[PDB]
Design a protein around this ligand. Structure first.
Ligand SMILES: CC(C)=CCC/C(C)=C/CC/C(C)=C(/F)COP(=O)(O)OP(=O)(O)O
Ligand SMILES: [Mg+2]
Ligand SMILES: [Mg+2]
Ligand SMILES: [Mg+2]
Length: 535
């Protein structure tokens, strides 16, 4: 016998199965974008700009999702700002300067916020009537590190007053503030925040810059075309496998998986990386379902071993259905090796593989704990549950398609650097807070919050609160890990960051976790992969 198949079909159908680029439009957009690209550049390279105007300019270009065209110009400008470390005396500009620098690795001192606090060390209540200042302080409070205790109350301060003033603010500011209170910029998925900013805010700004707005809308729509091609290509791939019929117990969420990959990196140069990444997320999805929604203690034990040995010869050692899965997994990695041959980078594929073996080992342990009704101590729980988030694995995977990834980068990653650990913790801890009830009602007493309660002898509330501070501490670690000098180039840190951002966005709703599939993601998928921004 097997467990009752619940998982419902993909509410997407074949919307993405086939998409044909309109080359006429693509070139038209590309061609004009090129022009707008140079106009914008000259805006950045312009001399005699005030500090406030330069920062607002960088900020706007970043929120518009077009800053990836000016990585160097923006860096040079911020570098120069960091060194001359001149002091503007208004909250708004100081909080912005602080955020932009810190997000870019410049360890600017949080001492810049001293002039805004009293002797006691708390923010001057007299700032409560400066909305723009409160807003930028709010966004800034989210990039603090363990050494920014000066900003310990910045979040509660800016929050309370922003909530209070919001109802009477003019649009789009009102919407910008309300949105920020629901999702800070630093911890949001880049494409999602860019889509919202472009069409809900900047397109309605009275003072909007038309060149920047047009540039932003065209670029976003153009990249979307690329994304739709990829998702189409990946959708055909998923169809050929046909697990929907061979492995009926498995969920069909390739679209949701693509969204995840898109959140890791959206730039066109990462097109190959994205395709490779989504294929892996989809594949490891089957394995998860197989472990906790179908396979028996005995089959899983054999599956785990087959994965560790990793050789087709083991396929016969597995039951018929696990053969479909297993065979598909091996071929996938064989495809990766073939894709990287061109650039002679097939030798890194093994790193992703050892990470998958790790995920499978821990899944198996997870079920063994389930079967025995074992409720481990938090430490033992995390030693296993961290890897089952698959984050070490996805992070490793995201490097595969990155042309610039070197063995050194993978070596650094293999040691579980602090920035990656933090990202993993955030996923684990946020998931456990969101999926406690459900898993608890299925006998999964080896669930995070559970272990925490028994371990510490505290209520479900104190346990979730404990987990929140872990997520909080973890975010501080991520922010610290982005400060220069970085152990690897920032290009390889951003994906870890983005993985954590995906977490915050997929479980924004702890009030139910909200059926991850449909709810939560559906809106974003429609906004990033279905509807183009109306010009
Ligand atoms: C933190 C964890 C482990 C999962 C939720 C967040 C993540 C990283 C999702 C992507 C990994 C995949 C493809 C799953 F199927 C994950 O499986 P499940 O979301 O249906 O749920 P459980 O494995 O926690 O039972
Ligand atoms: Mg599982
Ligand atoms: Mg599951
Ligand atoms: Mg859980």
């Amino acid at each position: 016998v097997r467990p009752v198949a619940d998982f419902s079909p993909s509410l997407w159908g074949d919307q993405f199965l086939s998409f044909s680029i309109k080359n006429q439009v693509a070139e038209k957009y590309a061609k004009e974008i090129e022009a707008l690209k140079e106009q914008t550049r000259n805006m950045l390279l312009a001399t005699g700009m005030k500090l406030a105007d330069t920062l607002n300019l960088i900020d706007t270009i970043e929120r518009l999702g077009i800053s990836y065209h000016f990585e160097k110009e923006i860096d040079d400008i911020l570098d120069q700002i960091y060194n001359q470390n001149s002091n503007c005396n208004d909250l708004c500009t100081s909080a912005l300067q602080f955020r932009l620098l810190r997000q870019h690795g410049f360890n600017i001192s949080p001492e810049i916020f001293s002039k805004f606090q009293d002797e006691n060390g708390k923010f001057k209540e007299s700032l409560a009537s400066d909305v723009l200042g409160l807003l930028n302080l709010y966004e800034a409070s989210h990039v603090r590190t363990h050494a920014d205790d000066i900003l310990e109350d910045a979040l509660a301060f800016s929050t309370i007053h922003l909530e209070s003033a919001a109802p009477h603010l003019k649009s789009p500011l009102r919407e910008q503030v309300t949105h920020a209170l629901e999702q800070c910029l630093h911890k949001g998925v880049p494409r999602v925040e860019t889509r919202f900013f472009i069409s809900s805010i900047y397109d309605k700004e009275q003072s909007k810059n038309n060149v920047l707005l047009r540039f932003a809308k065209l670029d976003f729509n153009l990249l979307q075309m690329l994304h739709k091609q990829e998702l189409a290509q990946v959708s055909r791939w998923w169809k050929d496998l046909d697990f929907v019929t061979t492995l009926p117990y498995a969920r069909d969420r390739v679209v949701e998986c693509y969204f995840w990959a898109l959140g890791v990196y959206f730039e066109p140069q990462y097109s190959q990386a994205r395709v490779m990444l989504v294929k892996t997320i989809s594949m490891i999805s089957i394995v998860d379902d197989t472990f906790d929604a179908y396979g028996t203690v005995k089959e899983l034990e054999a599956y785990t071993d087959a994965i560790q040995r990793w050789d087709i010869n083991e396929i016969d050692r597995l039951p018929d259905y696990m053969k479909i899965s297993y065979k598909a997994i091996l071929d996938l990695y064989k495809d990766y090796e073939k894709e990287l041959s061109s650039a002679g980078r097939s030798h890194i594929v093994c790193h992703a593989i050892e990470r998958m073996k790790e995920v499978v080992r821990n899944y198996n342990v997870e079920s063994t704990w389930f079967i025995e009704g074992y409720t481990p101590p938090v430490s033992e729980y995390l030693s296993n549950a961290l890897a089952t988030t698959t984050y070490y694995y996805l992070a490793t995977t995201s490097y595969l398609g990155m042309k610039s990834a070197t063995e050194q980068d993978f070596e650094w990653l293999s040691k579980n650097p602090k920035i990656l650990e933090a990202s993993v913790i955030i996923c684990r801890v946020i998931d456990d807070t969101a999926t406690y009830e459900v898993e608890k009602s299925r006998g999964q007493i080896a669930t995070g919050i559970e272990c925490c309660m028994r371990d510490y002898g505290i209520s479900t509330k104190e346990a979730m609160a404990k987990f929140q501070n872990m997520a909080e501490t973890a975010w501080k670690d991520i922010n610290e890990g982005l400060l220069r000098p970085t152990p690897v180039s920032t290009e390889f840190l951003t994906p870890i960051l983005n993985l954590a951002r995906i977490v915050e966005v997929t479980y924004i709703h702890n009030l139910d976790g909200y059926t991850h599939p449909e709810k939560v993601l559906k809106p974003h998928i429609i906004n990033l992969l279905v509807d183009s921004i109306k010009i």
